[PDB]
């Protein structure tokens, strides 16, 4: 019967966009199309604009509270960013969702400065994964420097003036040597990664006792059926392959050299043997820890939103 979530179907969620009227400007439409050419502006208006408005109500409540607490705390303390996390399967659309929300949240005067950090950067470099026999376990708990990731969000929630994150490139399939990103007290930080709702129980080989989620204000799990995820993963793989036709520095150039059919077979096996296993064992069991679960159907169309009561 009753669950910890308010549940919206698409009709009810899209109905929210008039409760408070919002409309994209030309400049914004151009950013959004630059984030993802396949992303529907209709989908932005019906789904992501209401979601950005929902989040502004949460962020605004936090800022009002902070202003009250400053009455006795005093206004000398550090600026602490509001942290939104985005979890879900490999290839469900976390990066797209994060980039879209970054663009939309940047509107509001209360919170113009929005940073985006992906947990990919906190993977151990390939040389270390190789040393440990983990090269086909990339994305599994053992492949992350999870202590460093927890320290990064901890430091942000400690009010450090700057914190630095390592960065990964899907193009070179590795952590970028000397490519670290520095953030400086943003209003919002969006942390995107499959493992953002994981905890010490997922890392029994090297446990931690305070979790990423203990430093996150609001978490979104993007959900979809396995059959869709596989299709989206394979399609994305083929787009990276296309990108590599003329980029011999892409790791995907190895696959550009193969027939499309054989590339598809490789991508299918990577999905089945690595990412699907990761989803079932490590990602999906964390879904019910999210503040909000956003479910997708064919063509990336959101068909359900569930929000913690």
**Residue positions in the annotated binding site?**
88-95
By CB under 8 A, what part of segment 36-65 binds a second copy? 53-54, 57-58, 61, 64-65
CA–CA distances in Å: residue 10 to residues 13, 47, 89, 232, 295: 5, 8, 21, 21, 10
User: Considering CB distances under 5 to 8 angstroms, the limit depending on partner class, which of ligand 0JR, a second copy, ligand ADP, none binds residue 92?
Assistant: ligand ADP
Rounded CA-CA distance 238/261 in Å is 10
Packing angle, helices 26-35 and 94-105, rounded to 10: 160
Range in contact with ligand ADP (rule: CB under 6 A) among 14-22, 70-78, 83-91, 177-185: 83-91
- Window 27 to 86, contacts with ligand 0JR (CB under 6 A): none
Q: Which is nearer to a second copy, 78 or 297 (CB)?
A: 78
Work out whether 237 is an interface residue with ligand 0JR (CB under 6 A): yes
Residue 154 contact among ligand 0JR, ligand ADP, a second copy, none, beta carbon within 5 to 8 Å by kind: a second copy
Total residues contacting ligand 0JR by CB under 6 A comes to 12
Q: Taking each helix axis as running N to C, give the angle between helix 226-244 and helix 260-270, from 0 to 180 degrees, rounded to the nearest 10.
A: 130
Residue 29 sits in the site that holds a second copy (CB under 8 A) = no
The CA–CA distances, whole Å, from 183 to 111, 116, 156, 164, 281 equal: 15, 9, 9, 6, 32
Mask: binding to a second copy, 210-229, rule CB under 8 A, as x and -?
A: xx--xx--------------
Least distance to ligand ADP, CB of residue 76, Å = 31
**Of the candidate residues 59, 84, 87, 91, the single one contacting ligand ADP (CB under 6 A):** 91
Q: Which partner from the list a second copy, ligand ADP, ligand 0JR, none does 207 bind, CB cut-off 5 to 8 Å by kind?
A: a second copy
- Residue with smallest beta-carbon separation from ligand 0JR: 139
- Residue whose pair of structure tokens reads 């499309």 in the numeric block: 260
- Interface with ligand ADP includes 138 (CB under 6 A)? no
52 binds, among ligand ADP, a second copy, ligand 0JR, none (CB under 5 to 8 A by kind): none
173 binds, among ligand 0JR, ligand ADP, a second copy, none (CB under 5 to 8 A by kind): ligand 0JR
- Considering only residues 38-57, where is the footprint of ligand ADP by CB under 6 A? 38-39, 43
Task: Please state the closest distance from residue 261 (CB atom) to ligand 0JR, in A.
Answer: 17
Interface residues with ligand 0JR (CB under 6 A) are 90, 120, 138-139, 170, 173, 194, 237, 251, 270, 274-275
């Amino acid at each position: 019967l009753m669950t910890p979530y308010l549940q919206f179907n698409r009709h009810q969620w899209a109905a929210l966009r008039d409760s408070v009227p919002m409309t994209l400007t030309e400049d914004e439409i151009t950013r959004l199309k630059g984030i993802n050419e396949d992303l529907s502006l209709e989908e932005v208006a019906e789904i992501y604009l209401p979601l950005s408005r929902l989040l502004n109500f949460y962020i605004s409540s936090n800022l009002r509270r902070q202003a009250v607490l400053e009455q006795f705390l005093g206004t000398n303390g550090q600026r602490i960013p509001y942290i939104i996390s985005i979890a879900g399967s490999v290839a469900v659309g976390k990066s797209t969702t994060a980039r879209v929300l970054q663009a939309l949240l940047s509107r509001w005067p209360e919170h113009r400065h929005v940073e985006l950090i992906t947990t990919d950067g906190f993977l151990h470099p390939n040389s270390v994964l190789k040393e440990r026999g983990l090269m086909k376990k990339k994305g599994f708990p053992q492949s992350y420097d999870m202590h460093r990731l927890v320290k990064f969000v901890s430091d942000l929630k400690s009010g450090v003036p700057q914190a630095t994150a390592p960065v990964y490139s899907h193009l070179i399939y590795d952590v970028i040597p000397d490519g670290d990103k520095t953030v400086a007290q943003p209003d919002i930080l969006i942390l995107e990664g499959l493992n953002v709702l994981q905890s010490g129980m997922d890392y029994p080989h090297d446990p931690h006792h305070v979790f990423v989620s203990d430093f996150v204000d609001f978490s979104i799990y993007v959900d979809a059926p396995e059959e869709l995820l596989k299709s989206w993963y394979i399609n994305r793989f083929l787009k990276f392959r296309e990108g590599a036709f003329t980029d011999p520095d892409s790791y995907f150039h190895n696959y550009a050299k193969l027939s499309k059919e054989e590339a598809v077979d490789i991508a299918t096996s990577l999905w089945n043997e690595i990412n699907l296993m990761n989803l079932k064992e490590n990602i999906l069991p964390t879904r019910e820890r999210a503040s909000l679960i956003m479910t997708k159907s064919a063509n990336h169309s959101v068909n359900q939103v569930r929000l913690r009561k």
